[PDB]
Design an enzyme around this catalytic site. Structure first.
Site, PDB file in Angstrom:
ATOM      1  N   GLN A  79       0.811  -1.233   0.000  1.00 11.66           N
ATOM      2  CA  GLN A  79       0.000   0.000   0.000  1.00 11.66           C
ATOM      3  C   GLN A  79       0.840   1.276   0.000  1.00 11.66           C
ATOM      4  O   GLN A  79       0.614   2.138  -0.842  1.00 11.66           O
ATOM      5  CB  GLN A  79      -0.981   0.010   1.197  1.00 11.66           C
ATOM      6  CG  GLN A  79      -1.730   1.361   1.276  1.00 11.66           C
ATOM      7  CD  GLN A  79      -2.772   1.352   2.365  1.00 11.66           C
ATOM      8  OE1 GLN A  79      -3.593   0.444   2.417  1.00 11.66           O
ATOM      9  NE2 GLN A  79      -2.767   2.356   3.251  1.00 11.66           N
ATOM     10  N   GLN A  85       0.850   3.901  -3.135  1.00 10.94           N
ATOM     11  CA  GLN A  85       0.274   5.260  -3.006  1.00 10.94           C
ATOM     12  C   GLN A  85       1.327   6.355  -3.182  1.00 10.94           C
ATOM     13  O   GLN A  85       1.071   7.347  -3.868  1.00 10.94           O
ATOM     14  CB  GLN A  85      -0.497   5.413  -1.665  1.00 10.94           C
ATOM     15  CG  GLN A  85      -1.677   4.416  -1.596  1.00 10.94           C
ATOM     16  CD  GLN A  85      -2.726   4.667  -0.517  1.00 10.94           C
ATOM     17  OE1 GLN A  85      -3.916   4.449  -0.761  1.00 10.94           O
ATOM     18  NE2 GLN A  85      -2.364   5.076   0.698  1.00 10.94           N
ATOM     19  N   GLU A 139      -2.873  -7.758  -2.246  1.00  9.91           N
ATOM     20  CA  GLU A 139      -4.324  -7.637  -2.374  1.00  9.91           C
ATOM     21  C   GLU A 139      -4.575  -6.546  -3.435  1.00  9.91           C
ATOM     22  O   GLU A 139      -3.660  -5.755  -3.721  1.00  9.91           O
ATOM     23  CB  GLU A 139      -5.043  -7.359  -1.030  1.00  9.91           C
ATOM     24  CG  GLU A 139      -4.646  -6.054  -0.349  1.00  9.91           C
ATOM     25  CD  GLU A 139      -5.560  -4.861  -0.492  1.00  9.91           C
ATOM     26  OE1 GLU A 139      -6.642  -5.009  -1.094  1.00  9.91           O
ATOM     27  OE2 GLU A 139      -5.204  -3.775   0.019  1.00  9.91           O
ATOM     28  N   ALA A 195      -0.660  -9.874   3.312  1.00 12.20           N
ATOM     29  CA  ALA A 195       0.208 -10.478   4.290  1.00 12.20           C
ATOM     30  C   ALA A 195      -0.269 -10.242   5.731  1.00 12.20           C
ATOM     31  O   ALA A 195       0.441 -10.641   6.653  1.00 12.20           O
ATOM     32  CB  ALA A 195       1.618  -9.929   4.088  1.00 12.20           C
ATOM     33  N   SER A 254       6.861   0.278   2.608  1.00  9.67           N
ATOM     34  CA  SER A 254       6.830   0.561   4.023  1.00  9.67           C
ATOM     35  C   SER A 254       7.709  -0.450   4.751  1.00  9.67           C
ATOM     36  O   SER A 254       7.938  -1.570   4.258  1.00  9.67           O
ATOM     37  CB  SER A 254       5.398   0.477   4.576  1.00  9.67           C
ATOM     38  OG  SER A 254       4.906  -0.850   4.500  1.00  9.67           O
ATOM     39  N   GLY A 289       4.288  -2.650   7.003  1.00 13.32           N
ATOM     40  CA  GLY A 289       3.351  -3.580   6.371  1.00 13.32           C
ATOM     41  C   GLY A 289       3.932  -4.979   6.202  1.00 13.32           C
ATOM     42  O   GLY A 289       5.155  -5.137   6.160  1.00 13.32           O
ATOM     43  N   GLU A 337       4.384  -3.515  13.827  1.00 11.85           N
ATOM     44  CA  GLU A 337       5.271  -2.827  12.868  1.00 11.85           C
ATOM     45  C   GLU A 337       6.755  -2.804  13.306  1.00 11.85           C
ATOM     46  O   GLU A 337       7.607  -2.979  12.429  1.00 11.85           O
ATOM     47  CB  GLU A 337       4.749  -1.414  12.550  1.00 11.85           C
ATOM     48  CG  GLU A 337       3.384  -1.472  11.873  1.00 11.85           C
ATOM     49  CD  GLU A 337       2.950  -0.173  11.237  1.00 11.85           C
ATOM     50  OE1 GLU A 337       3.832   0.648  10.897  1.00 11.85           O
ATOM     51  OE2 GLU A 337       1.725   0.016  11.066  1.00 11.85           O
ATOM     52  N   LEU A 339      23.149   6.154 -10.524  1.00  9.59           N
ATOM     53  CA  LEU A 339      22.996   5.482  -9.229  1.00  9.59           C
ATOM     54  C   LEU A 339      24.303   5.192  -8.528  1.00  9.59           C
ATOM     55  O   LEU A 339      24.354   5.248  -7.296  1.00  9.59           O
ATOM     56  CB  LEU A 339      22.156   4.185  -9.360  1.00  9.59           C
ATOM     57  CG  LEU A 339      20.739   4.357  -9.932  1.00  9.59           C
ATOM     58  CD1 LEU A 339      20.021   3.020 -10.008  1.00  9.59           C
ATOM     59  CD2 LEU A 339      19.914   5.338  -9.091  1.00  9.59           C
ATOM     60  N   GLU A 358      26.935   7.063  -8.497  1.00 16.24           N
ATOM     61  CA  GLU A 358      27.406   8.296  -7.877  1.00 16.24           C
ATOM     62  C   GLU A 358      26.705   8.574  -6.548  1.00 16.24           C
ATOM     63  O   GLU A 358      27.324   9.153  -5.659  1.00 16.24           O
ATOM     64  CB  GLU A 358      27.325   9.486  -8.846  1.00 16.24           C
ATOM     65  CG  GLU A 358      28.281  10.615  -8.471  1.00 16.24           C
ATOM     66  CD  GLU A 358      28.061  11.920  -9.193  1.00 16.24           C
ATOM     67  OE1 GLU A 358      27.650  11.874 -10.373  1.00 16.24           O
ATOM     68  OE2 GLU A 358      28.263  12.994  -8.571  1.00 16.24           O
TER      69      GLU A 358
END
Ligand SMILES: Nc1nc2c(ncn2[C@@H]2O[C@H](COP(=O)(O)OP(=O)(O)OP(=O)(O)O)[C@@H](O)[C@H]2O)c(=O)[nH]1
Ligand SMILES: Nc1nc2c(ncn2[C@@H]2O[C@H](COP(=O)(O)OP(=O)(O)OP(=O)(O)O)[C@@H](O)[C@H]2O)c(=O)[nH]1
Ligand SMILES: COc1ccc(/N=N\c2cc(OC)c(OC)c(OC)c2)cc1O
Ligand SMILES: [Ca+2]
Ligand SMILES: [Mg+2]
Ligand SMILES: [Mg+2]
Lengths: 426, 436, 155
Positions: free
Chosen positions: B11, B15, B71, B99, B140, B143, B183, B252, B254
């Site tokens: 999620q 987002q 999901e 999950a 995250s 999650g 978490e 990347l 650098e």
């Protein structure tokens, strides 16, 4: 995670089960024939969680109705929403269990269990992504207690990765002075500690006390007690039936509410308490955490909260709810365990229940629930020490050691609650 | 030109990904259907924006991005939103069951059902690249999918793309907008398993973003939409060097050279200024000295910590807008005459500067005012160890009683994995102490 | 052996069979293997008419089984109010103590038979009697939060 299969067993199980369907059908705008007459899309968004969509845009409860007594089917059918249930989902025996757990679990109940499992399989195969099961039953009788627990173990064997949730009604001599009920309840608690993921303890002692002392009903009836049960069941299932900020389901509830596998017995609470026919956010947060508003006869101020989930329903400021919930936690800080950080979760849902602009429902995993198990244990021991009516159980093939094992497991559960009530962070 | 593939997991990753790609389109002049009138080469090209967008024969500019979730509800909002025609339909991958906030379900039991499909779809994008440099992974910590599925994905990408760089944008949990009690467990487990496989990770502390929304934007109760819009502005400022011409952090590799002195201490702190409410449309424009000074104020940081308590190992200042290089030099000279900035004795005591002379873009519907000049400072400071200590303490409180552990062991994980992960975090805390 | 048949008739509630067995010399005070008499069994299974007839034919109202249970302890535990009253009228010891230190008051209080608690208190039940763990009937009411019972024990 969408569909839930609901099973209701025995007299109490079917009585509270029927009231649950009446209350949630009204909230979702479903009438007794199955037609949607509502005025909001939020009512249909998660309708598939509890209802199947049949031809003609009709919504049918995903419910299985079970009893060893045939008479219960007639009372359910004669109810307002009695014709909404699927006729093939009524599985009824010939002769009840006579308040005998052994008849429900080993003889009459065992003969009818395969028929119920056939109906469970057909409802489960019809699901896109089944979450699990919800069972309503009493622990004091014979069918809901004995056959209900046998059904839980068999469903657990065929669907081991799905969640098993029960609404389990605890006996009290204030409502039914039948002395074998502590035996049936203790034998059932031994099964529920092992085979359910989450159990809501609905205590007839608390329901009677609220009706008699708080609502001033001099002679509470089962309808008065069931009014509190239906309000509680609507409240605790809110986050499964409406969108909200969380995409709640039965597994996320268990993972966040159950820190130790055997401590999965919740104390529900509700505010405002009302009687049939007959608030600000700070008042709702205060009432919600009061012993007089708990549906289990336990004082939460005698133990500690391991985890709490609260649902506020109605139009209100979410900032106000955040502040009042933070305030209750600071003032009542000694009643929360300090070794589970951020153990209180709040949800707000816009749709309030019928007849109320605002309401709050509390789900607590509190060590004070040991008071309920101690009350039943003392009654079980008073009877069992004198071997009163033991032949009624052993005559159905039960062994006397099953009683000893059930007593010992319930006393171990009480000790486990005391262990975490006294633990410190350090 | 060398391509970058972005992967958005769970999620929070999805987002934030949606907000980032909307902002990238506005910055580059790409319309919601993928058309870009300013691109004179139709069907292909080697321009700097092609690092993030491929081109079709019909002039469509398509994000080099994959969105994955266990999901479908969050990805379904991308499939039906404003930018539904922008992404490759096969780039949006969903399972049916999530999950349940459990790292072990994301990594071992549910995650294994879709990992091969995700890797085959990533390979399809990789095969379209002429010189793939690596991956940007958004997720995250809290999650079950963001923690568990991301660790499994990063393990497989290390085997299949051995020499390619992997950068993370990770959302660090806050009590104010959290989802789950577990978490801290998911955060430690994913940090331990991804540490070897990630080259550089930008943590975004949800409490820091929440406080910035409340204090600077006067938003009483920030939602994820408010947090994500501010996060996307910071992420855009960090990735701008890869999508536009410039002389700092142009690839990347650098980012690692400039910000990561040793492999394990690969967590730079981002600070961004100015953040001004859209209701203050006539605000006075702040000078280069004012916005540069604001980078050393803890209130403007993406992670809550105090760099005055730590030492710097690297510092990069990335400006956007009306910024004269001599004014930057003068503002830095003043900053060096301040006791609060201490560098470690083994790194050159200097600041690397990059200027993009186009001011930041604001999204319609956003909470930020337009500004003529802005800055993002990226630093590697030992004070970020304070964020790990806070998380490790919450883990220890629950783990001492083995609270919730049965949920992880029941989903194919060995209990010893908790102790191994915590021991690695104790070593990481000591790595910061040994530097300073 | 008519004593064994009288024990079965008393448990089963066979009123006529009890009368025939006594008329043929059956031992009214026969015991089963655990020391239970026909009066204990009639009081446990709620056969009021059998309790009255056994008491008019020499049954010992205060007989104890191997665990010290009297017929009054069992009537109070099971909740047979009318049988409690008949036993008390025929001289049952209201404060008899069993092997667990329980009196009939303790058992009526634990099982929530509040009308029986009232009757026992009116017949001189000792509110200070402690069980083997030191608990009185008032302690049981306070410990289990039974306010209705605590109110009756304070009257
Ligand atoms: N709250 C509540 N309790 C009830 C209701 N009906 C019965 N009970 C309680 O349930 C227990 C008795 O169990 P029942 O459900 O009647 O029995 P059963 O499950 O049908 O089992 P058998 O009749 O023995 O086959 C007692 O504690 C009753 O007080 C009801 O509608 N509401
Ligand atoms: N900033 C920000 N944080 C978010 C967002 N969505 C979720 N979070 C945070 O992410 C954590 C929860 O993880 P999610 O990403 O929602 O979970 P997931 O990866 O989908 O995993 P499961 O749902 O458990 O399978 C919490 O700390 C949330 O506060 C978002 O859009 N923005
Ligand atoms: C104690 O912390 C947590 C508790 C539950 C969590 N997850 N899901 C649910 C949350 C619910 O109400 C808040 C709920 O309403 C009863 C629900 O019903 C299905 C599920 C997340 C948490 O962080
Ligand atoms: Ca081109
Ligand atoms: Mg019945
Ligand atoms: Mg998710």
């Amino acid at each position: 995670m969408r569909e839930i299969v609901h099973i209701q067993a025995g007299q109490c199980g079917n009585q509270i089960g029927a009231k649950f369907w009446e209350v949630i059908s009204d909230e979702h705008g479903i009438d007794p024939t199955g037609s949607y007459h509502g005025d909001s899309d939020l009512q249909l968004e998660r309708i598939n969680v509890y209802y199947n969509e049949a031809t003609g845009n009709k919504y049918v409860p995903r419910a299985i109705l079970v009893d060893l007594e045939p008479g219960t089917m007639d009372s359910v059918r004669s109810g307002p929403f009695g014709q909404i249930f699927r006729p093939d989902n009524f599985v009824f025996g010939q002769s009840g269990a006579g308040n005998n757990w052994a008849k429900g679990h080993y003889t009459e109940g065992a003969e009818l269990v395969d028929s119920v499992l056939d109906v469970v399989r057909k409802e489960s195969e019809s699901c896109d992504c089944l979450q699990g099961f919800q069972l309503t039953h009493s622990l004091g009788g014979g069918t809901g207690s004995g056959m209900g627990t046998l059904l839980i173990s068999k469903i657990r064997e065929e669907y081991p990765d799905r969640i098993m949730n029960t609404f389990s009604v605890m006996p009290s001599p204030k409502v039914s002075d039948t002395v074998v009920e502590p035996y049936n309840a203790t034998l059932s608690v031994h099964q529920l500690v092992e085979n359910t993921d989450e159990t809501y303890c609905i205590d007839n002692e608390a329901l009677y006390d609220i009706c008699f002392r708080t609502l001033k009903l001099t002679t509470p009836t089962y309808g008065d007690l069931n009014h509190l049960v239906s309000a509680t069941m609507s409240g605790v299932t809110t986050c499964l039936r409406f969108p909200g900020q969380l995409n709640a389901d039965l597994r996320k509830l268990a993972v966040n509410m159950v820190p130790f596998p055997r401590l999965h017995f919740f104390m529900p609470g509700f505010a405002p308490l009302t009687s049939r026919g007959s608030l600000t956010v700070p008042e709702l947060t205060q009432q919600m955490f009061d012993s007089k508003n708990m549906m289990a006869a336990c004082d939460p101020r005698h133990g500690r909260y391991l985890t709490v989930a609260a649902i506020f329903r109605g139009r209100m400021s979410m900032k106000e709810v955040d502040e009042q919930m933070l305030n209750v936690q600071n003032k009542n800080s000694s009643y929360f365990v300090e070794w589970i950080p951020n153990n209180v979760k709040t949800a707000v849902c816009d749709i309030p229940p019928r007849g109320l602009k605002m309401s709050a429902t509390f789900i607590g995993n509190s060590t004070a629930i040991q008071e309920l198990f101690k009350r039943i244990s003392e009654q079980f021991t008073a009877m069992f020490r004198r071997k009163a009516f033991l032949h009624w159980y052993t005559g159905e093939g039960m062994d006397e050691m099953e009683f000893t094992e059930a007593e010992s497991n319930m006393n171990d559960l009480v000790s486990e609650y005391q262990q975490y009530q006294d633990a410190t962070a350090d | 030109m060398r391509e970058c593939i972005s992967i958005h997991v769970g999620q929070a990753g999805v987002q934030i990904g949606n907000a980032c790609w909307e902002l990238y389109c506005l910055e580059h002049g790409i319309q919601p259907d993928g058309q870009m009138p300013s691109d004179k080469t139709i069907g292909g090209g080697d321009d700097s924006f092609n690092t993030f967008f491929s081109e079709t024969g019909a002039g469509k500019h398509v994000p080099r991005a994959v969105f994955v979730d266990l999901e479908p509800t969050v990805i379904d909002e991308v499939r039906t939103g404003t930018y539904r025609q922008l992404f490759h339909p096969e780039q949006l991958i969903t399972g049916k069951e999530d999950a349940a906030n459990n790292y072990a379900r994301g990594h071992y039991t549910i995650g294994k059902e879709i990992i091969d499909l995700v890797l085959d779809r990533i390979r399809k994008l990789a095969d379209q690249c002429t010189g793939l440099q690596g991956f940007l992974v958004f997720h995250s910590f809290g999650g079950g999918t963001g923690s568990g599925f991301t660790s499994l994905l990063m393990e497989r990408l290390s085997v299949d793309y051995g020499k390619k760089s992997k950068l993370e944008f990770s959302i660090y949990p806050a009590p104010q907008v959290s989802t789950a009690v577990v978490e801290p467990y998911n955060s430690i487990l994913t940090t331990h398993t991804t540490l070897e496989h990630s080259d550089c990770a930008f943590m975004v502390d949800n409490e820091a973003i929440y406080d910035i929304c409340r204090r600077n934007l006067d938003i009483e109760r920030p939602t994820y939409t408010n947090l994500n819009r501010l996060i996307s502005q910071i992420v855009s400022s960090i990735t701008a060097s890869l999508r536009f011409d410039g002389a700092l952090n142009v690839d990347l590799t650098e980012f690692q050279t400039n910000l990561v002195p040793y492999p394990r201490i690969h967590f730079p702190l981002a600070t961004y200024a100015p953040v001004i409410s859209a209701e203050k449309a006539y605000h006075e424009q702040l000078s280069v000295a004012e916005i540069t000074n604001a980078c050393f104020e803890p209130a403007n940081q993406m992670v809550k910590c105090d760099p005055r308590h730590g030492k710097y190992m690297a510092c990069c200042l990335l400006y956007r807008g009306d910024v004269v290089p001599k004014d930057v030099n003068a503002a830095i000279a003043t900053i060096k005459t301040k006791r609060s900035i201490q560098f470690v004795d083994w790194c050159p005591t200097g600041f690397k500067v990059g200027i993009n002379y186009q001011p930041p873009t604001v999204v319609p519907g956003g909470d930020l005012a337009k500004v003529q000049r802005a800055v993002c400072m990226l630093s590697n400071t030992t004070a970020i160890a304070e964020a790990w200590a806070r998380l490790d303490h919450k883990f220890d409180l629950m783990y001492a009683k083995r609270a919730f552990v049965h949920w992880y062991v029941g989903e194919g994980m060995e209990e010893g994995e908790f102790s191994e992960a915590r021991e690695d975090m104790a070593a990481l805390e000591k790595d910061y102490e040994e530097v300073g | 052996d008519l004593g064994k048949k009288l024990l079965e008739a008393a448990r089963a509630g066979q009123d006529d069979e009890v009368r025939i067995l006594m008329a043929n010399g059956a031992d009214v005070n026969a015991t089963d293997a655990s020391g239970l008499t026909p009066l204990h069994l009639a009081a446990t299974y709620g056969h009021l008419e059998i309790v009255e007839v056994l008491l008019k034919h020499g049954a010992d109202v205060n007989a104890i089984d191997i665990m010290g249970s009297t017929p009054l302890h069992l009537a109070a535990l099971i909740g047979h109010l009318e049988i409690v009253e008949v036993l008390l009228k025929h001289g049952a010891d209201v404060n008899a103590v069993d092997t667990w230190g329980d009196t009939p008051l303790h058992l009526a209080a634990i099982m929530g038979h509040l009308e029986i608690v009232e009757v026992l208190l009116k017949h001189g039940a000792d509110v200070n009697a402690q069980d083997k763990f030191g608990k009185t009937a008032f302690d049981i009411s306070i410990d289990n939060g039974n306010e209705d019972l605590a109110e009756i024990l304070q009257k």
